[PDB]
Symmetry: C3
Subunit: 282 residues, 3 copies
Amino acid sequence: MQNGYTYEDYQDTAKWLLSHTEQRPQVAVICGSGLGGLVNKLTQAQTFDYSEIPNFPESTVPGHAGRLVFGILNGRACVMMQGRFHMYEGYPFWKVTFPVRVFRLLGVETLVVTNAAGGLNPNFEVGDIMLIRDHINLPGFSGENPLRGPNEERFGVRFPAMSDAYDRDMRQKAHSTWKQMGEQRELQEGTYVMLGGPNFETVAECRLLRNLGADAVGMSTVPEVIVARHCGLRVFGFSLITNKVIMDTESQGKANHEEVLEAGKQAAQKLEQFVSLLMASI
Amino acid sequence: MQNGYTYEDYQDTAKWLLSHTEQRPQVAVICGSGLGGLVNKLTQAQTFDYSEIPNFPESTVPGHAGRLVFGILNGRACVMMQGRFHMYEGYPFWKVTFPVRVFRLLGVETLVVTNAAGGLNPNFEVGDIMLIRDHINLPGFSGENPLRGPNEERFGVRFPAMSDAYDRDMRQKAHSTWKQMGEQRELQEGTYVMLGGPNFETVAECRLLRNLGADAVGMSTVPEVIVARHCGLRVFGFSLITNKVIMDTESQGKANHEEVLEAGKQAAQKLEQFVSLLMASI
Amino acid sequence: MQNGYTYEDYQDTAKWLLSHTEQRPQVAVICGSGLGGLVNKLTQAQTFDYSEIPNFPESTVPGHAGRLVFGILNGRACVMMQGRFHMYEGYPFWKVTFPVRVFRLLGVETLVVTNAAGGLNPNFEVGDIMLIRDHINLPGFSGENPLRGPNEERFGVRFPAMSDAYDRDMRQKAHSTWKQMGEQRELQEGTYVMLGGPNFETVAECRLLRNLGADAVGMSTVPEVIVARHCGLRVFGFSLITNKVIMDTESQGKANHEEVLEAGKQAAQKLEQFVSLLMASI
Ligand SMILES: O=c1[nH]cnc2c1ncn2[C@@H]1O[C@H](CO)[C@@H](O)[C@H]1O
Ligand SMILES: O=c1[nH]cnc2c1ncn2[C@@H]1O[C@H](CO)[C@@H](O)[C@H]1O
Ligand SMILES: O=c1[nH]cnc2c1ncn2[C@@H]1O[C@H](CO)[C@@H](O)[C@H]1O
């Protein structure tokens, strides 16, 4: 059926967290595949396994520890999802996005989303960071949407707009911050396209995606952005280009989850530095 | 699971309606968002709330009264759905299309469908009326189809063709009728594309849709057309262009349901006049 | 819910087959619409109705007998599915692909898939045989995937690659074999695109599909290939172009299942000869 959580369920979970930590975060960060390292830079950290927080789902994917960590990052109080949920695990979108609404009830105002993605844009190189300026929601085209079913007015409106989903001001900040880091490569920016997974794309599918105007492909994030914007959260996000997708039938190798995680550690020091510095801007 | 209604369920509902009204309609009209006004031009009208008709689903969307009205429009006896059902409300396609099969069992032969849609075609202006000459069924591409499951031979064939879904003769009639109205703008005609909703499209999604050859985007209608053609109903339909979709990231505003309903009243007098005059042609 | 079969279920079904036939096939063939004739060339054949094999689903589509036949084809021991399962029948992808995993447990190493498809490529003519070199999985884009849910490590990895799904060596063999047959028309090769069905495509949908780079359209096969590659089966397949899809609104006729089955018998002698000769190559 549709959404199985009532407003009270989100409320109960929020109260439970509030009664177990003195931390009052204003920023929420969702760590994607190979990005779980961002957590180790938190000060005064407190961790909760998803399995001990009442109505919380569980991460089953390698590279997703499945822990909620509160802490202080570069002066800002925040909460981090060290690992997320995906539709390919068997979860409905209303389960995948449960934490987002709980965050809103905690008093969070900004949500930063991260993920590992395949590069469709030929100008992209493995290791690149791409600011997400827009998305294409394939599952949404068929009715698979976290907002399907009766609307909860206490969270948002029935027909939320998505054209302004990725905060313009934060993207300007991201660009200025990147410049201060003195990096050699430029910060990329583009359209993220989501598909269900869990298998990797065929050559025909990649060419099709690129021709639709997508710069990177992945199996998450979009559902969380929809719910985030629906409840009024300011959203900012980026993809770590973990590999160049095969575009020719004379393909040498083939995508694998290992390459994705390996790439994560390689860029760890870089993107961790980036996110921490970004905390100064709000 | 698949379709939960058996042939008998449609039959029972049809018998109930037949035993409560002397009206024997030959035309059925489904009113979309902001089009519920078409009903007020009916003579000898009889209304039934969806909630009192046995196996009927219920409209939960603003702009959808949720009433079945029988009456005489410009000499033709017809039945109107003042408000329809959508997949984003949590309804399976076999629930959304329930009324269509009941209509067939009432003895209806023609089905006219209406809806509010976003304009993808740059030549479209807010207020335009677009005859639907074809559709692109996105949900259908993934298997979400009102005909999924065992086929009911009493209604139609297992593999119904859709290339001739929108009646050619009625579209010629629509054009001749529009000319007699002396309108200033030309009657548009194009391809309607359906996606699940309920959120509005991103810029990337709109560009993608337009490039696929779609002229207008919406969250309904197609399921009803499939079932209508499957059971042998002559189908004709049109979209009221309620807004121009944002195609640039330097977007001024963002889509909202209010604009859609406001647009409906603006064109009310026009499209109501159009549909009533169209009744003369069958 | 997700996959309802546990590893043991596939195992039980495999043991049942092994205890009822002395046949030990190395090749598995799935016959599509109008291709059920391939079975009549088997020697020392043994047939099982799907309804008598424990955890087996059932074919409900005309042109799909619904029988598992073991036999010897041109010296090679193989098993054939005379008729397959489709999502439009009401089956979840984990039911549609059940036989594929059972085959793996029987000791099968190669899977050849066949199907009836509509030609999108203008160079295609009715009667053509198209080797599938790649596919576009539309249902997969929305999360409808036979691998959705927890991964069974005993079968394969969590994130299987699909870029090398259609065996290169077998496609070279197919081309050499076709030459030896002395056929007049060339063996086609292209991208197969899958959509849910059961209705046939509209003109707008066909133009869209062709523009995405698809050569033929159908309502099956892809799910079986995903599971086959996930568990390590070598895969090879081909489509019988049963009709040219309508690409213009001044359409003369409209697609029908009859034309599909009629086309099957016409090419029967040809494709049966092709598959039997192909058995010599492994
Ligand atoms: O090339 C890619 N295509 C699709 N998803 C990808 C790709 N690269 C990374 N991911 C993402 O990382 C996990 C798989 O490693 C998936 O969760 C997917 O969202
Ligand atoms: O721009 C648009 N995109 C998608 N659906 C639209 C648009 N404009 C109108 N509708 C239609 O009207 C309702 C929302 O107001 C939805 O039911 C949708 O089908
Ligand atoms: O033009 C076509 N479009 C879509 N599927 C087709 C077409 N031609 C053959 N099939 C395939 O044959 C059955 C219907 O006859 C369906 O199972 C479909 O997979």
